[PDB]
């Protein structure tokens, strides 16, 4: 098999050149292999302070936060609280606009509502304005025909999905996903006492961190360390090991195939491609020109339950952070790459593929 010594060389020889080429200050990596996570840390979390990256350093996950959103939703579905086939309106009777008529919770969850934009406008600062926004939105496409990557879409699915529980989103997440999985250093809002662990992001020489915004916890506001993230990946890769019945089901639902777009399949948060898949196919869908383009979908009805022979992944970025996670259930291997610099997505998947290919 692969030796620990060999794995360390593979990780160092892949990660060290990447950091130098992409000028990334710090990086924390976890490689899941043979039932155990292996940690590798590099560089700095804060240049000014000269603080090294450690397995406790907190990185902004950006869109990888959507995997937590998906699982939390799947768990609510498994509890009988929500259904993906339900009209959005069942959860928001105030959304009276007739354009929402045939739009389901599935569409919000999978960016398939019909043209919801990338971001919730900055002018949207509260509930009543959020209503104004969706109420005046005019869909470019009919529901279930076009996938357009949007925080305005999945962010609303997140808010609405926790409504029947009676709990605010943050408490629903902590109570039903984070605490049971022992993700004690995973935060939507980082306490004052945990702040010294929070790395600084770096853009083009400026120290940066994520700013607030409507539906941020649902779409891009989660921060964690590489330990919690490795254990999160391990729960999603092997949910047979998750004791909570509905949480086990929610994990499955988030890795289920709802739509096919080219060579990939849309889940709830997670995205998948059939394994074996070559690097060039994964890398080519990594591009922003592609990731952000509106594309037609082929519906999978009924949705297909998780398939073990899959490359499941998700990229995430904020102004100062660049993260990526990928695992193959069939092979029980996975990788987590957290970084305090948003470097090119294709570079992320290339390195992840190369090291996983070594296993
Ligand atoms: C998820 O990480 C995410 C939310 C939409 C990040 N948004 C942005 C952005 O700058 O608007 C990026 C881009 O990386 C350039 C494009 C894909 C999504 C991500």
UniProtKB/Swiss-Prot annotation:
**Reactions this protein catalyses:** a beta-lactam + H2O = a substituted beta-amino acid
Query: What's the impact of mutating residue 87 to P?
Result: In strain: MHN1 and Q980R
Q: Name one Pfam family in it.
A: Beta-lactamase
- GO molecular function terms attached to this record: beta-lactamase activity
Stated consequence of mutating residue 131 to V: In strain: Q980R
Q: Which residues bind substrate?
A: 314-316
Q: Does the keyword RNA-binding apply?
A: no
Q: What is the effect of changing residue 298 to V?
A: In strain: Q980R
- Which GO CC terms are listed, alphabetically? outer membrane-bounded periplasmic space
One GO BP: antibiotic catabolic process
Where is this protein found?
Answer: Periplasm
- Stated EC number for the protein is 3.5.2.6
Chief place of localization = periplasm
User: What EC class is this?
Assistant: hydrolase
Alphabetical UniProt keywords: Antibiotic resistance, Hydrolase, Periplasm, Signal
Identify which residues the record assigns to the active site. 63 (acyl-ester intermediate), 149 (proton acceptor)
Q: Tell whether Zinc is among the UniProt keywords.
A: no
One further remark on this entry is: The sequence shown is that of strain P99.
Q: What is known about what this protein does?
A: This protein is a serine beta-lactamase with a substrate specificity for cephalosporins.
Which family is this protein grouped under? Answer: Belongs to the class-C beta-lactamase family.
Protein name per Swiss-Prot or TrEMBL: Beta-lactamase
Which organism is this entry from? Enterobacter cloacae
């Amino acid at each position: 098999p692969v030796s620990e010594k060999q794995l360390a060389e593979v990780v160092a020889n892949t990660i060290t050149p990447l950091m130098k080429a992409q000028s990334v200050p710090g990086m924390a990596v976890a490689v899941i292999y043979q039932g155990k996570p292996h940690y590798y840390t590099f560089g700095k979390a804060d240049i000014a302070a000269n603080k090294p990256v450690t397995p406790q350093t907190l990185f902004e996950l950006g869109s990888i936060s959507k995997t937590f959103t998906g699982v939390l939703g799947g768990d609510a579905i498994a509890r009988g609280e929500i259904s993906l086939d339900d009209a959005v309106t069942r959860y928001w009777p105030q959304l009276t606009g007739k354009q929402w008529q045939g739009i389901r919770m599935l569409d919000l969850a999978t960016y398939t509502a019909g043209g919801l934009p990338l971001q919730v406008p900055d002018e949207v600062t509260d509930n009543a304005s959020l209503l104004r926004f969706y109420q005046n939105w005019q869909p470019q496409w009919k529901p279930g025909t076009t996938r357009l990557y949007a925080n305005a879409s999945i962010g609303l699915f997140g808010a609405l999905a926790v409504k029947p529980s009676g709990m605010p989103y943050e408490q629903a997440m902590t109570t039903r996903v984070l605490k049971p999985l022992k993700l004690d250093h995973t935060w939507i809002n980082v306490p004052k006492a945990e702040e010294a662990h929070y790395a600084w992001g770096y853009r083009d020489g400026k120290a940066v961190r994520v700013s607030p915004g409507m539906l941020d916890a649902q779409a891009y506001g989660v921060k964690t360390n590489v330990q919690d993230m490795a254990n999160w990946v391990m729960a999603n890769m092997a949910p047979e090991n998750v004791a909570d019945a509905s949480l086990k089901q929610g994990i499955a639902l988030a890795q289920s195939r709802y739509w096919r777009i080219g060579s990939m399949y849309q889940g709830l948060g997670w995205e998948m491609l059939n394994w074996p898949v070559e690097a060039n196919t994964v890398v080519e869908g990594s591009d922003s020109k592609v990731a952000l383009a509106p594309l037609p979908v082929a519906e999978v009805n009924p949705p297909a339950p998780p398939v073990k022979a899959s490359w499941v992944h998700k990229t995430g970025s904020t102004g100062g952070f660049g993260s990526y996670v990928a695992f193959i259930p069939e092979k029980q291997i996975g990788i987590v790459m957290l970084a305090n610099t948003s470097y090119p997505n294709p570079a992320r998947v290339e390195a992840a593929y190369h090291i996983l290919e070594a296993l």
